[PDB]
Amino acid sequence: SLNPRDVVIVDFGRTPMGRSKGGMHRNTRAEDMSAHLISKVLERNSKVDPGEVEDVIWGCVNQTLEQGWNIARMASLMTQIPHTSAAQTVSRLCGSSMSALHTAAQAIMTGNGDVFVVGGVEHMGHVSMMHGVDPNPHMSLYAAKASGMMGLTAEMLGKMHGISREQQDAFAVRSHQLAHKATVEGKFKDEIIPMQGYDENGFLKIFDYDETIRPDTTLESLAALKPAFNPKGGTVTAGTSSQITDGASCMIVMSAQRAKDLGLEPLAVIRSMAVAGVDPAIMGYGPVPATQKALKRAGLNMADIDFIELNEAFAAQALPVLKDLKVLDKMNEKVNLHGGAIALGHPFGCSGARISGTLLNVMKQNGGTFGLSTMCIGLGQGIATVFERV
């Protein structure tokens, strides 16, 4: 049986991943997008009193304009969540959303709250990444400035492990294809929360799919693109890179005790959490260190993990991570079975919980027991989480 203070993920709900360059969310603020998600998710679960939510931990990166001033509370106030609750925004670049899950997890375990609402958001359309950036010259005194350009790191990490242009493009195809498949077959119906938006004609309508996905993506269509971060001899193209996407992901979390009391069947259970660091130059290698640390704390071997969710930053980084994790030959059998950030987009402050949430749906749907969700972080970081289906 479970222990009282064991972290349990009750539910998971994400928004339709829409393009940033004039996508379906071009007229929706990140705050509202988050507030609506949290609100709708709490509805499906009428047995978890919003007043019990000790805190709302939201992940976000470019915290300015719409996303500035603790968006966690800003989005929480427009929810059925009482004013008596708290909220904080956790930023760790890419792994923001996941760190959020960890913070609440540890809180629950230590007896500092019973019910939480974690997740993350990132509206790169209204608040682009290059917006408001002030490169500190002094950084070049301790680390290469180029390491700040995620793309170039993908190039470096790629060169090292030796991944051909074809190897990457082929990966992107597998991501798009699998994403479309899961979509059409309805493997996303449970996690995707229908949301209002505007089509290319300014008309109002509800989307329940991911605009980002491109089924026509073929090796032929990808081999036509030019190197995005290194014209003179590059492999990392816009096609093998994650998409600029506006989107939010939510997740209700609580202790097994307060959970067993509400008689609601768990979606999964957190067994181990881990964060690690690597050199900024090859930040894409962050997953392996973070994963190894998680597996040890979870007392598990990489082989004991049934399904894996590796956020696809670049085909040039995902592949190497999978190779060193010794599971590349098991890809099509248990690695991102619903596609990755290449086809589903990668909302910085959101992807953390999104990949983990989708990870649970894969396990539940395919009778998995142990699952793993990890992702590389900017400036040399990594994060991993090992869930469990009971």
Partner: protein, 715 residues
């Protein structure tokens, strides 16, 4: 068809969808007159009765959706008792309420202007589509009343308290972009694809994709605000408006009290609140004519329209003189899509202009508000020059040469020989007669006065001083050119001090008298700032400059010697004769010590008392209430004279010129409305006890005439 009226034609469409169209046959616009409201009733009942209907689309067959309301026919329906009045509006609201209760999707395809009742009709429907070139708002406040057709009910629950209070209390119009942001509108599209949007939207409501029922709910139930969140929201709103609206509160301070009470109520109960308070304003605050404010606005929207399409398109413009005023006129003309030429005599001038225009553009880019690609276009729009070789295609030319009758005449007459004959010329002078400058030119019909206020990019108002020989086309073009530059132009006839300045100094005359009466100016402006004025008298004087105000005094004294020629050294002469030239000098009524680039400080120092001693002629005692009279009365009366001498054509224009220029407390209406806020008959009485102060406090003959007759300026 389902219904074919003279104002509304409810035509059927595909999939059982019906289109309720607003087209007042015979008239130019659509409005909620008796006939229209009546047909709406018949229209709604028709659709309601017809069970085959699967949705309703509301449109307009005009250039505008539905403008205000022609209240002239609702006036007799206001003199009735508060019961037969509330129930009266209640019955009128039953229409919109029913349309809101139609068990079917309803969308409002806003094609154009949707003000007052026009917007209230839209707020009734579930969804609202809007053309990017349209505008919507609730300017009821300008009439002394607030929305009476559910406006104070639906808007607050649709876009939020704060947003509603703002939209209502101010009565400002709102563009598509803004209307969409606060969520007053659900979708904005190009005029061409408006109908398609409304149709495509409705079908998405019928299919069940869009929950039209869930979207309607918000304006049928209580507000989502906490009991505590309400206290904060309302008290702050009430407070801020209470201070800038003052004792006679029209729609501003009341609208909020109406929303604060109907907060925990649903539609029906909220409607009763709205109606009750509406009766109070009509029989108290606005009883001293709502008719006037309304018809006055009517005259304006038509006047601004007559000017609008007889006016010559200004594709190419130019300004005479760079530097301060030139750089602004060039900036404004450039930032609004109007290629302008910066003409001057020396290279040093062009430098100053280009520099200032650049400092403003960079100012926005260096924080995030303007695109680097945008700053490029604006800069290219401004084209420097020291000759008239390129003035060949310029349509309108503006002069900014130094204040000198002779010089300005030479310059103006000069440019007139280097532009098309059908080109319009305009001076930016402030103390020189336009009718005088025109005499130099050989084409006075095209010469007028375009008065900007320093800084050109900050101040909204732009006076269009019409000379005695100025053609309508000349004024029309200038007015339009001002509006295109994102300004608010007002036609004013040529006269010393024009409208604004001519009224601004008599106001200062009351101040000068206070200081001479041993009244502490610090106490004075604190009272005037508590009245609603942006800056205080003394503080303002420092900003403008004692040296400037000193010169202006002589300009007005020579103009109207009979009342503006005082002859006793005042604080104005004291500071000037004491080297205290104001804020620019660093010392005026206050001291200003500069921090750095963008900031300076207002300080107090007993050293100013020494300089003012010679001005104190009596240690007269005065209440903060009287202080307001010594100031306001002289300002109001002068406005009445500007209206009587024919400087401004309508009372409406006579007040906005003060609202946008001198900075007249907005929620108090204006100089003329303020008078009505007290009562013309009761105002003359007040003026008389202060008659011992001079001709500045003496009511006009026409004012005394309309005093006994119980006549007010708005009617």
């Amino acid at each position: 068809m389902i219904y074919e009226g003279k104002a509304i034609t409810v035509t059927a469409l595909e999939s059982g969808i019906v289109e309720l169209k607003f087209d007042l046959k015979g008239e130019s616009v659509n409005k909620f007159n008796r006939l229209t409201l009546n047909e709406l009733r018949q229209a709604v009942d028709a659709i309601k009765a017809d069970a085959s209907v699967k949705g309703v689309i509301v449109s307009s067959g005009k250039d505008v959706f539905i403008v205000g309301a022609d209240i002239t026919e609702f006036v007799e329906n206001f003199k009735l008792p508060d019961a037969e009045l509330i129930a009266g509006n209640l019955e009128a609201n039953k229409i919109f309420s029913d349309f809101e209760d139609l068990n079917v999707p309803t969308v409002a395809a806003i094609n154009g202007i949707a003000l007052g009742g026009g917007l209230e009709m839209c707020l009734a429907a579930d969804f609202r589509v809007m053309a990017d070139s349209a505008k919507i708002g609730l300017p009821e406040v300008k009439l002394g009343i607030y929305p009476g057709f559910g406006g104070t009910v639906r808007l607050p629950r649709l876009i939020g308290v704060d947003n509603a209070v703002e939209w209502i209390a101010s009565g400002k119009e709102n563009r598509a972009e803004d209307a969409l942001k606060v969520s007053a509108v659900d979708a904005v599209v190009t005029a061409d694809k408006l109908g398609a949007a409304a149709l495509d939207l409705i079908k998405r409501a019928i299919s069940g994709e869009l929950d039209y029922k869930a979207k309607r709910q918000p304006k049928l139930e209580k507000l989502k605000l906490n009991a505590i969140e309400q206290m904060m929201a309302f008290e702050t709103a009430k407070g801020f408006v209470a201070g800038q609206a003052g004792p006679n509160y029209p729609a501003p301070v009341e609208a909020i009290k109406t929303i604060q009470k109907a907060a925990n109520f649903g539609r029906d109960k909220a409607l009763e609140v709205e109606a009750a308070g509406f009766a109070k304003l009509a029989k108290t605050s606005a009883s001293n004519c709502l008719i006037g404010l309304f018809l006055n606005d009517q005259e304006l929207k038509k006047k601004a329209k007559v000017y609008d399409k007889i006016a010559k398109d200004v594709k190419q413009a130019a300004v005479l003189g760079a530097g301060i005023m030139g750089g602004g006129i060039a900036y404004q003309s450039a930032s609004k899509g109007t290629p302008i030429l910066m003409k001057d005599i020396n290279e040093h001038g062009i430098e100053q202009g280009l520099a200032e225009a650049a400092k403003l553009l960079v100012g926005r880019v260096d924080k995030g508000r303007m695109t680097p690609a945008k700053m490029a276009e604006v800069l290219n729009g401004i084209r420097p020059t020291l000759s008239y070789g390129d003035f060949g295609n310029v349509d309108l030319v503006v002069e900014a040469v130094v204040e000198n009758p002779k010089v300005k005449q030479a310059v103006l007459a000069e440019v007139e020989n280097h532009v098309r004959e059908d080109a319009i010329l305009a001076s930016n002078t402030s103390t020189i007669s336009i009718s005088l400058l025109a005499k130099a030119l050989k084409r006075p019909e095209n010469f007028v006065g375009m008065h900007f206020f320093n800084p050109v990019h900050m101040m909204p108002l732009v006076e269009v001083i019409r000379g005695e020989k100025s053609s309508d086309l000349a004024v029309a073009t200038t007015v339009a050119y001002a509006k295109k530059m994102g300004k608010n132009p007002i036609v004013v006839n040529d006269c010393p001090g024009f409208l604004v300045n001519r009224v601004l100094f008599p106001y200062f005359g009351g101040f000068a008298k206070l200081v001479s009466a041993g009244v502490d100016f610090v106490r004075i402006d604190k009272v005037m700032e508590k009245f609603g004025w942006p800056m205080g008298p003394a503080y303002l004087m420092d900003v403008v400059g004692i040296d400037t105000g000193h010169h202006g005094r002589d300009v007005m004294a020579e103009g109207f010697p009979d009342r503006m020629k005082d002859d006793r050294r005042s604080a104005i002469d004291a500071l000037y004769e004491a080297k205290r030239l104001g804020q620019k000098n660093g010392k005026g009524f206050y001291a200003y010590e500069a921090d750095k680039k963008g900031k300076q400080k207002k300080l107090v120092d007993s050293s100013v008392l020494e300089v003012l001693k010679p001005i104190v002629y009596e240690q007269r005692d005065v209440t903060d209430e009287d202080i307001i009279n010594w100031m306001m009365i002289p300002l109001c009366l002068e406005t009445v004279r500007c209206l009587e001498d024919g400087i401004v054509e309508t009372a409406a224009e006579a007040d906005m010129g003060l609202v946008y220029g001198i900075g007249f407390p907005l929620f108090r209406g204006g100089a003329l409305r303020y008078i009505d806020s007290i009562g013309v008959a009761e105002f003359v009485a007040l003026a008389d006890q202060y008659a011992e102060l001079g001709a500045l406090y003496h009511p006009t003959a026409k004012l005394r005439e309309m005093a006994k007759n119980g006549q007010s300026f708005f009617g």
